[PDB]
Symmetry: C3
Amino acid sequence: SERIASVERTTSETHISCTIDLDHIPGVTEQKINVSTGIGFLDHMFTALAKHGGMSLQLQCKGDLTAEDCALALGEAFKKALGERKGIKRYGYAYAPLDESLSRAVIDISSRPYFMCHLPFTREKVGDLSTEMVSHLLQSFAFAAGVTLHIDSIRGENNHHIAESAFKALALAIRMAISR
Amino acid sequence: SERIASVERTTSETHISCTIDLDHIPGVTEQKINVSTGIGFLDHMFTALAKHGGMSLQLQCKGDLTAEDCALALGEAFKKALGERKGIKRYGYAYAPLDESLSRAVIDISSRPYFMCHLPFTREKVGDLSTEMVSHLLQSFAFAAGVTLHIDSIRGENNHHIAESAFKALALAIRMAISR
Amino acid sequence: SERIASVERTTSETHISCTIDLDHIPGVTEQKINVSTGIGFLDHMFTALAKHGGMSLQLQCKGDLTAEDCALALGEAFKKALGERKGIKRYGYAYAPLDESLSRAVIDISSRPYFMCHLPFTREKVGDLSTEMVSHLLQSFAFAAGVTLHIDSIRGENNHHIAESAFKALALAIRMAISR
Ligand code: EMC
Ligand code: EMC
Ligand code: EMC
Ligand code: EMC
Ligand code: EMC
Ligand code: EMC
Ligand SMILES: [Hg+2]
Ligand SMILES: [Hg+2]
Ligand SMILES: [Hg+2]
């Protein structure tokens, strides 16, 4: 029984739709990912999050071009799909390198939203997206998902690498935590 | 063949009994845990250690109400149950968060007792039990169990959370290390 | 289909031969390891690397008695045996203690050679081999293998222990990363 959930939100200025699948029929089915937030870099991060997290994800945000809202919808869908959380490993942790950067993610998929992080960015924006917003998106995701999450940059120079290594680490940790 | 072992100790002032099971018949049998040391907080820690470690544990200490002795009996039983240590993963490591706290445990289930830790407590006692005693109990457990163990608080503010996150991390590491 | 590869190199002063097997037929076949570099300590490290990495390794360097070249051949063979890298976990990480030392290794078996490390040695040589050369051998291995590797000494006093804990951690990380 696949863990699937869909979430849709509409305001006068934005429409957000998100569908997620936590599983796949081995051999038979495969991961499918389409992310369009209006921010190229964020799209890259959420895509990396879904790919390495072993999940399928449809996330589109239309409207006259904050982003926290897409992190929230994602977290909302993840939480619904997790449903009962019966039979899962629950605790997950992982390290992910990206050339010179190294990040760690530790997650407890319980029902206690909590978020701690250490991300020493050095520019103002990362490509399409603002750096200060990274910690906020992750907090939004964790709070909406109802999980306890700690994200830590171990070392890193390039803000893109720090950001991407963190999302990959979160992905691997989630993959570990949600497995049954 | 389940890994089970029992240990009983008697002095003029204390009686300690401890039975442990490292396995369970999937589907068929289930974890059973009963811990009564006379110190509520310690009971909470050893229970958390057994639960998340995938073990069954019976640990009772009667007598006119040090605690190190119960950590020692636990370690003694764990070691006996481990018996031959044939076919185990041997090395285990895990991270466990608890709201704002994050702890790590790394264990080598070999025959070299060793213990290193970093637990910056900030009060004198944690509920029913003294904080300075935490590192000692863990050392007693590791020495009695004959394992190499490193416990590290990564961050934490609440002494109860630091303590519990450390025991959970030790539990997950053990679960990894003893699996066959 | 076992992942096997052989590499041989000859100069006017040295002959290096290396054969590696990343797998074994469960029950049926078993790990076989023979390492002779001319440097006792290095032999100990590469042997530990193969043993705990779940690999079989034949590595011999003959000639009038730098070592980086043997790290390179090893990395070269590992890379060839990895071949297509299809179906592997790809990301691996592990912690390995050795009495008072604790080291971590994080590896991304992709096609991006990268190496970062933190190894605070305190002597000039470790037994048969020079300490400053450790980071270099690991870099040579990572570059030749085409992997992204981060090695970190968490704590340690004895240079032999720091060195060995690092190689064991690299081994466990590789074992995780190459599994299918
Ligand atoms: C503005 C990105 Hg949902
Ligand atoms: C708001 C904790 Hg990074
Ligand atoms: C005094 C607790 Hg065994
Ligand atoms: C006595 C080492 Hg924490
Ligand atoms: C000089 C060791 Hg290949
Ligand atoms: C040359 C990076 Hg340890
Ligand atoms: Hg949008
Ligand atoms: Hg007691
Ligand atoms: Hg040689």
